[PDB]
Amino acid sequence: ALTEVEQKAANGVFDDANVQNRTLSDWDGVWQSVYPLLQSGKLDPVFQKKADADKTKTFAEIKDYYHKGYATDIEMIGIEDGIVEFHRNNETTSCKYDYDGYKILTYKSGKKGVRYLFECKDPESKAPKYIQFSDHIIAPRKSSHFHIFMGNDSQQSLLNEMENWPTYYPKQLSSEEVVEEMMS
């Protein structure tokens, strides 16, 4: 359902003038971490497809890359009415996040991506002070899945993080629906 501008942008190619602000509501819903899907072998067909289409890396090497990438103990994330809550160890934290703009990044490959920045200003909240969404979308559209970076140092410290990117899909998807979306 993507305009070809959207299409190329999801592949990391776009001009800075086409990036646009996004509200937190683009991420409304209940989301499952995909790390447990990795840890149970259910994402293995993704890693094997990528391994078979690339001469430089083996299945195990791709699997280890995404094991590092997806690792997190935030199992679920719920987003609604301006509030993000993070599920961890049978407890949640939550905050009403304020939008703080976006940041356009150029990866070492030459591909580009956009991070959408939010900040918690609730002295009562125990949620992360800074979060960043990144989901291969650069202008308003309901997200299909997202990477999130979370931290309590600064937004810049998050901008530096390129190895760990907890990734989330809608709760209702089965592991096979997740695998199918990932192979596209």
Binding residues (CB under 5 A) for Zn ion: these are: 16, 81, 87
Residue 89 CB contacts under 8 Å (≥ 6 apart), including other chains? 73
- Residue 44 CB, shortest distance to Zn ion, in Å, is 18
Indicate the residue among 22 and 87 with the shorter CB distance to Zn ion.
87
At 97, list the tokens.
Answer: 């996040």
- Residue 149 CB, shortest distance to Zn ion, in Å, is 9
- Residue 63 CB, shortest distance to Zn ion, in Å, is 13
- Give the CA-trace dihedral at 81, 167, 1, 9, to 10 degrees: 110
Widest CA span in the chain: 51
Indicate the residue among 15 and 98 with the shorter CB distance to Zn ion.
15
Indicate the residue among 87 and 129 with the shorter CB distance to Zn ion.
87
Indicate the residue among 41 and 107 with the shorter CB distance to Zn ion.
107
Residue 13 CB contacts under 8 Å (≥ 6 apart), including other chains? 111, 112
- Residue 147 CB, shortest distance to Zn ion, in Å, is 6
Between the alpha carbon of residue 159 and those of residues 86, 132, 167, the distances in Å are 20, 9, 16
- Residue 92 CB, shortest distance to Zn ion, in Å, is 5
Residue whose C-alpha is closest to residue 79's, from 10, 2, 22: 22
Indicate the residue among 118 and 173 with the shorter CB distance to Zn ion.
173
